[model samples]
Target: DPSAEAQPIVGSDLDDQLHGTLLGEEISGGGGADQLYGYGGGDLLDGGAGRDRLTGGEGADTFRFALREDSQRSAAGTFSDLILDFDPTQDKLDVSALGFTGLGNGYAGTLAVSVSDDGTRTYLKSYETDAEGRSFEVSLQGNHAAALSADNILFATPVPV
Candidate 1:
């Protein structure tokens, strides 16, 4: 694994690199397990085509687990996860990496945001426990919040539709 040189980042990188920045060799390099650390702020960290670990240091950040190729950048293929740590001063997290799809905040559950060419949507859902234990899902489609075998706590549809 290659190391990333500490560098100043703005907007996208800062938003994603809160847990870890793809600096120096971390960018355009892969293989084995990797660890990324976000010193602070809303970061955007991408695992990029490998098994990796990421952490959102603090504040509202987003984590992308898979390598995002330009060709694969779409509703179905879009690969990314968000890390919103919360900031009272701002009132809300700025999950811009989620794009126009939008975002929300909640406690003890899965909060998901879905995206599309037309627009974006945000929602939340409670957790469900099974033989495997608690489980929850936020469908990428319109960011539908659903518990296992449960009705749509918040249906998938355009916001304000």
Candidate 2:
């Protein structure tokens, strides 16, 4: 589907497209450059190892990545996944599968985060490689990196109290 352009789900909720879901639905795109949308409620989307676009329409949503290849950034500023309308206040990022340390100096597991110069988007990865790198997880459109913290992000799978 290279250069085929993107399709947006319109009208009803029964989107026949690959990985499209109903309200509060979940999708796991196994491969290919796919497009996924979580129409309503708290949905979970894991666009696997391919250049993908994930949009959590509304409600408390979740975007998950289970490995380095799940959503990889070969270099800096470039991304493998694009997240449109990411609300840091409600949506959560599950990078736990990418060896999330969210710390350390240029290590592969350290959580690497960056915001666009315009301040309207937040770029992230599980590693750093500036003068080094950033593995390039997902780009959060319309949100700032400063708005994310331990509460909005996690490593692997965390339990509740």
Candidate 3:
């Protein structure tokens, strides 16, 4: 558990279950199926590997996923992360650092955003291929997965030299 002092909490290479208090914190699930909780304030959660569960208890939160140099880059339809209680109109999905800043012909080539449905469950998939032609996907699943829109996603900005 992180202190309520507005500090950031980063998980280890192993699977961990971490909790946050009533302050802004950055929680990262380093590896494995980890559980992260944001009790209050705007928070950022990143689940590194395996499946993860992120809960933002109030306040606008952000979820991060990275597909850079992923070992399973060629594996199609891999399950990534889960955002429980996601408010499409409030929260944000940040894939800015995953080399998806390019929509059609930028850094990582092209990005494809779509939603998958199975009648009962809905999932949002943001996928892209690198210059080498390897494919990857980052999915968000929950009751509101189908409610996600392009406005809810944030791309990275160019850096000055």
TM-score for each candidate, following the candidate numbering: 0.29, 0.68, 0.63
Off by over 4 Å in 3: 1-5, 66-79, 101-122, 126-134, 142-151, 157-161
Candidate that would win on lDDT: 2
List the candidates ranked by TM-score, beginning with the highest: 2, 3, 1
Q: Rank candidates by lDDT, best first.
A: 2, 3, 1
**Ranking 1 against 3 by TM-score, winner:** 3
User: In angstroms, how far off is 133's CA in candidate 1?
Assistant: 24
Q: Tell me the lDDT of model 3 at 17.
A: 79
Best by TM-score: 2
Error of 3 at 110 (Å): 4.4
Report model 1's TM-score to 2 decimal places. 0.29
Q: Give me the runs in candidate 1 sitting further than 4 Å from their true place.
A: 1-31, 65-161
lDDT of 3 by residue, 1-161 (tens): 44365455767867677787566786775677777777687887777766666777666677766645331334454535666655645677776677453444223544444444553224433245433565544545444444444457666646310
Clashes, model 1: 17
What is the alpha-carbon lDDT of model 1 when measured against the actual structure? Answer: 0.31
Write candidate 1's Cα lDDT for 56-125 as tens digits.
4344343332232210222223223222222222212222232222123322322333334353323222
